[PDB]
Short mmCIF file of C-alpha atoms in Angstrom, two decimals:
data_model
loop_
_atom_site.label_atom_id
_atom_site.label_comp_id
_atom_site.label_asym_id
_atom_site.label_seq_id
_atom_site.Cartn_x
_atom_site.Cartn_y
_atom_site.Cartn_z
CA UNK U 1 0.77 33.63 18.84
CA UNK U 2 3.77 36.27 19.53
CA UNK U 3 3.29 35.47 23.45
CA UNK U 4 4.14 31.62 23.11
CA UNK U 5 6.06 30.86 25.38
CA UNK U 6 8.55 27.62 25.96
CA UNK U 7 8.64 25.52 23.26
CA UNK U 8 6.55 24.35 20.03
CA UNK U 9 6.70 21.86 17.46
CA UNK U 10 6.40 23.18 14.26
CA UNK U 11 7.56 20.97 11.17
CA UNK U 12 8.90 17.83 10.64
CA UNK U 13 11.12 18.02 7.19
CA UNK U 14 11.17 14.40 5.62
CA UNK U 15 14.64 14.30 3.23
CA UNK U 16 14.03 14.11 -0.66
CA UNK U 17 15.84 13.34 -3.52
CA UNK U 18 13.80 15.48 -6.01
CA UNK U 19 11.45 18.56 -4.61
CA UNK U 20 9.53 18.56 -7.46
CA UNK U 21 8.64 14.89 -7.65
CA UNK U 22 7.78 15.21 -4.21
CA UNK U 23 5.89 18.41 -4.34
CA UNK U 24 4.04 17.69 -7.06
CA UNK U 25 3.03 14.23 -5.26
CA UNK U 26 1.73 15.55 -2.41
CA UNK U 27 0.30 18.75 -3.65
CA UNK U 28 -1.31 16.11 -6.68
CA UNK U 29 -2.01 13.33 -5.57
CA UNK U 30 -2.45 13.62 -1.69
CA UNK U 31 -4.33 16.74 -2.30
CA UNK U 32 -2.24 19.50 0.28
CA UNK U 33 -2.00 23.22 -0.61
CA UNK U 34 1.61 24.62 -0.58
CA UNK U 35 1.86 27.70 2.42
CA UNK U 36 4.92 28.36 0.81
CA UNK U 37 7.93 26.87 -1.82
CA UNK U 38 11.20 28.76 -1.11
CA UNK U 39 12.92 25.96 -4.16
CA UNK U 40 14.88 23.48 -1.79
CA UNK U 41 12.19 23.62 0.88
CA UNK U 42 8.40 23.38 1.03
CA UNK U 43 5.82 23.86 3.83
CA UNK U 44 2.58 22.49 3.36
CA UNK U 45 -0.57 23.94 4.81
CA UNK U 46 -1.33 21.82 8.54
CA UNK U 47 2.23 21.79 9.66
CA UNK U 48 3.61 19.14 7.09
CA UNK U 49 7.22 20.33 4.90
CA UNK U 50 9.97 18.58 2.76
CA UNK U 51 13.03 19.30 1.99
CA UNK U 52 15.95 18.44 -0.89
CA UNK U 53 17.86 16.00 0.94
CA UNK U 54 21.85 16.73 0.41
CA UNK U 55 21.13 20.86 0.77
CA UNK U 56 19.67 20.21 4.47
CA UNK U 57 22.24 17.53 4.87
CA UNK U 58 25.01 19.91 4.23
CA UNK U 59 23.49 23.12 6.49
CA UNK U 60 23.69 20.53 9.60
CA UNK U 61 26.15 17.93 9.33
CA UNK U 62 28.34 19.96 6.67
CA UNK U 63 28.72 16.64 4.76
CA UNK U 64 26.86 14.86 2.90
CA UNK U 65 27.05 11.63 0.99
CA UNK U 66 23.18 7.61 -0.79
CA UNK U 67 20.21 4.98 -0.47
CA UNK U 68 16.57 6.07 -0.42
CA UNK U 69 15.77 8.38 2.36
CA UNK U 70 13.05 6.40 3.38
CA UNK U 71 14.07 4.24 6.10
CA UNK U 72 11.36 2.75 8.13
CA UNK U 73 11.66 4.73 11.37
CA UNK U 74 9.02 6.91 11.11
CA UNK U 75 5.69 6.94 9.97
CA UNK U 76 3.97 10.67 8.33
CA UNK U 77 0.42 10.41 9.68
CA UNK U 78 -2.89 11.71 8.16
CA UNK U 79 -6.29 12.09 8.47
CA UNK U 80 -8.85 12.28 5.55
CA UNK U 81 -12.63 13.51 5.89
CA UNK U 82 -13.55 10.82 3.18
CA UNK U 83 -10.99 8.20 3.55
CA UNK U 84 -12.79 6.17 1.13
CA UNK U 85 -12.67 8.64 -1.84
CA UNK U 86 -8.95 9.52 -0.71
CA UNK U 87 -8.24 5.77 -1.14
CA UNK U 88 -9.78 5.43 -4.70
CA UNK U 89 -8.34 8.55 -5.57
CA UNK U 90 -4.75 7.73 -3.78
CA UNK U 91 -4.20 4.16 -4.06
CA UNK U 92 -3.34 3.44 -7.95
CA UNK U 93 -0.85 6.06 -8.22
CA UNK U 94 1.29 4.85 -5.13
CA UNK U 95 3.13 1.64 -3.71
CA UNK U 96 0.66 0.48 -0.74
CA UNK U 97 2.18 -1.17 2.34
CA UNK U 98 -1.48 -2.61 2.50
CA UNK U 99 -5.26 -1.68 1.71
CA UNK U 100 -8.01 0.62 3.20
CA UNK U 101 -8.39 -1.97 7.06
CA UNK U 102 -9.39 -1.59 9.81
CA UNK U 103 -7.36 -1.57 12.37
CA UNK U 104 -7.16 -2.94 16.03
CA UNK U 105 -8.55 0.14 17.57
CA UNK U 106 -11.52 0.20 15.09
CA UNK U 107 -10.00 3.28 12.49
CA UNK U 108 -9.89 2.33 8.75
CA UNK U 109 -6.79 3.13 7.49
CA UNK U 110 -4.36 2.42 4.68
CA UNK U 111 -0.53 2.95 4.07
CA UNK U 112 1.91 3.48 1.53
CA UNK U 113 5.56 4.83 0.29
CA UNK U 114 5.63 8.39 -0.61
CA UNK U 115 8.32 8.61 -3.91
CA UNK U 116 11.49 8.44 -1.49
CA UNK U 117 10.02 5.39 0.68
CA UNK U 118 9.48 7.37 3.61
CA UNK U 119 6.40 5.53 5.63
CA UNK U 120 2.65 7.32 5.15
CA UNK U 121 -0.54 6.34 6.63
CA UNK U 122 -3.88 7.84 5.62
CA UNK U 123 -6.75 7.48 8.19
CA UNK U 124 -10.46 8.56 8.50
CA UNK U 125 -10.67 11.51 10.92
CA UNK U 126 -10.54 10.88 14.62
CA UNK B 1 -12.87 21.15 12.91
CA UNK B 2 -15.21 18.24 12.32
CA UNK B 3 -16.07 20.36 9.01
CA UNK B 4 -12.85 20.21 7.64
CA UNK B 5 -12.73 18.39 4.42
CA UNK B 6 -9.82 17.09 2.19
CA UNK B 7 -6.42 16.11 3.73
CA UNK B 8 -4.98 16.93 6.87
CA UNK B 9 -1.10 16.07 8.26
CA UNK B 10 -1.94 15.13 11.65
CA UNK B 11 1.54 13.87 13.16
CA UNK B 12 5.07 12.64 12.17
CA UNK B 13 5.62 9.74 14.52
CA UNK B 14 9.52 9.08 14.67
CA UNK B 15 10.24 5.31 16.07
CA UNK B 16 12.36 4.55 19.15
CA UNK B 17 13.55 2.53 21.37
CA UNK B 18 12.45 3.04 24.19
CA UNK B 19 9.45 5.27 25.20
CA UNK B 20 10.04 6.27 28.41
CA UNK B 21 13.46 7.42 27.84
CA UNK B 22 12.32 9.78 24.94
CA UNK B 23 8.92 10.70 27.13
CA UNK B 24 11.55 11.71 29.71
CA UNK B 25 13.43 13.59 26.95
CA UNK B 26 11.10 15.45 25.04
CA UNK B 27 9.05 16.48 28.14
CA UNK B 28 12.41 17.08 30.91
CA UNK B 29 14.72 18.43 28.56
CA UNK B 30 12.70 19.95 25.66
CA UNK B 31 9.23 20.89 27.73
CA UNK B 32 7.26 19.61 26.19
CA UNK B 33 3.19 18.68 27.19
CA UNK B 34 2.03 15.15 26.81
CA UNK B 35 -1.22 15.16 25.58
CA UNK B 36 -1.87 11.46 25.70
CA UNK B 37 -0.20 8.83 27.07
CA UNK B 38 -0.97 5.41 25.66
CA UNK B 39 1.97 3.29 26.59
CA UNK B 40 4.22 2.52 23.79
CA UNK B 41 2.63 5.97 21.73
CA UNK B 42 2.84 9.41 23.17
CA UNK B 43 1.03 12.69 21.73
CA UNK B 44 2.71 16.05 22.60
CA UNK B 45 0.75 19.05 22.34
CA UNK B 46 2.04 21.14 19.60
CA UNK B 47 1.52 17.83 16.78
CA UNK B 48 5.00 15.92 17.84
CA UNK B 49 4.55 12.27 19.23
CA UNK B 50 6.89 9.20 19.19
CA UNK B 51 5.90 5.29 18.68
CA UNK B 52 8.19 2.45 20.19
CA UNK B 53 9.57 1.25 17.11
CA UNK B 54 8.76 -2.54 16.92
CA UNK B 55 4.88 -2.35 17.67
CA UNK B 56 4.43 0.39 15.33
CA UNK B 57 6.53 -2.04 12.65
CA UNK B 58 4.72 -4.88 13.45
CA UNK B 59 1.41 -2.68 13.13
CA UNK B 60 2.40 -1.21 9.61
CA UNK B 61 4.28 -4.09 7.81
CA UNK B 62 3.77 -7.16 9.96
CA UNK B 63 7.54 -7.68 10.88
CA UNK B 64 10.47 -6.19 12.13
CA UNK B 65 13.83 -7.21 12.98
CA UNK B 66 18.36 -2.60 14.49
CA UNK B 67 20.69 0.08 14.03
CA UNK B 68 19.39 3.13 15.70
CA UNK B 69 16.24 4.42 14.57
CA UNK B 70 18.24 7.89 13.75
CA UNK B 71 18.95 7.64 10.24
CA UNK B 72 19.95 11.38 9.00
CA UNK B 73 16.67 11.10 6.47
CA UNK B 74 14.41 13.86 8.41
CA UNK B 75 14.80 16.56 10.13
CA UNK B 76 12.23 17.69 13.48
CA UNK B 77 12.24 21.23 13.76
CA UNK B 78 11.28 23.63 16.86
CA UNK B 79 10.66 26.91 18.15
CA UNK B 80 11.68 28.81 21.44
CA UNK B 81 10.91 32.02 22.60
CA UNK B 82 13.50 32.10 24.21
CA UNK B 83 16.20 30.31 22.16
CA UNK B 84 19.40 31.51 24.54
CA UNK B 85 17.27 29.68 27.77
CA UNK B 86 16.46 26.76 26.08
CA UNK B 87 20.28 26.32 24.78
CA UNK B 88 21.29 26.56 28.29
CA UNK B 89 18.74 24.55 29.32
CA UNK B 90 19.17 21.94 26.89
CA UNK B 91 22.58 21.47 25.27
CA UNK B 92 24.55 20.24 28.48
CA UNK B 93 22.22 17.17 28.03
CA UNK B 94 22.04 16.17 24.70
CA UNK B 95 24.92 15.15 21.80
CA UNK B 96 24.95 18.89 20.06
CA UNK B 97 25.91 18.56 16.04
CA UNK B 98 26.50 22.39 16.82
CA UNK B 99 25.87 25.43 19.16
CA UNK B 100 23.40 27.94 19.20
CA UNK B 101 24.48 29.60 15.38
CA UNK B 102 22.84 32.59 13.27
CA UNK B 103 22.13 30.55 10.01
CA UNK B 104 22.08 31.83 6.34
CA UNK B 105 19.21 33.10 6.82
CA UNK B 106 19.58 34.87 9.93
CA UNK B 107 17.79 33.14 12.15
CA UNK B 108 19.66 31.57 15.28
CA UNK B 109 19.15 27.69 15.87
CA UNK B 110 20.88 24.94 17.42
CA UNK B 111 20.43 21.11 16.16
CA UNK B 112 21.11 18.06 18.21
CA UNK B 113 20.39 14.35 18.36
CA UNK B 114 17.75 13.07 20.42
CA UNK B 115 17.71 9.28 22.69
CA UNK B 116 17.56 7.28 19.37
CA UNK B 117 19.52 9.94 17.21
CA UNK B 118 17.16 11.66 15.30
CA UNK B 119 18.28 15.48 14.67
CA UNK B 120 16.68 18.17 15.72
CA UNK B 121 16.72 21.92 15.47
CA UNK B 122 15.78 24.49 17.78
CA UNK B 123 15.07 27.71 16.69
CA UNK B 124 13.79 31.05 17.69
CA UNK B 125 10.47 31.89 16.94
CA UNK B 126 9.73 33.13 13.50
#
């Protein structure tokens, strides 16, 4: 929409240490379809992107030093049609945080570490 | 799209401190829409929403003990139609990293910290 006006969210960029290990785990193994892959920076399809960590670090801060990015003050949150299959499929080839529950407001979910720690949940669709 | 199958990003859900200072933020200074208010989670239109930080740790990992949840590890990035207004707008308000600056790229942006010091960047519209 060229007539947007105000303002829009339209990424959140989680910092990497390794594009490719990162791309190819959440193009492979979370199942998302690359929009575009510039090198240092990749959007997903549905609004999700990453980014090498110390080449964004140095375009903002002009510095950059580091421990794992992920830092437990966030959480990336998706939804699967099949959130069984996605868990079967998923679940061996990641650290979980805990198993396919339900949760207090009756949504089965489960959650995990993507490869730089940063916080992921996978739910069925709302 | 109930039809839509496979794996969607929904929403990245940065932690804070204190949700009614960063409701008051995002929607005062940044305009932007709630589009549901629980209490301690807000949902922006656009896909941007906020947790307080403790329930939502509690709720993945079952404790939590904090620096600020700002942890230079992510980057939230958003559009303006009208990038110039929303600097003016905006910056007097917030700690700038920098001021409104035609990147590599050649697109003009600003970035800045929000309540809990995450960074963002403001950008015209692509």
């Amino acid at each position: 929409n060229l007539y947007f006006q105000g303002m829009r969210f339209v990424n959140p960029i989680p910092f990497v240490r390794d594009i490719n290990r990162s791309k190819s785990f959440y193009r492979d193994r979370l199942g998302l379809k690359i929009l575009e892959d510039f090198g240092s920076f990749v959007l997903f399809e549905t609004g999700f992107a990453i980014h090498e960590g110390r080449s964004l670090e140095e375009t903002i801060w002009r510095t950059s030093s580091q421990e794992a990015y992920g830092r437990r003050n966030m959480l990336l949150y998706f939804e699967h049609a099949d959130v069984d299959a996605a868990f079967q499929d998923i679940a061996p080839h990641v650290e979980l945080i805990h198993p396919l529950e339900r949760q207090a407001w009756g949504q089965r979910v489960f959650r995990f570490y993507d490869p730089d720690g940063h916080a992921i949940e996978v739910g069925e669709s709302l």
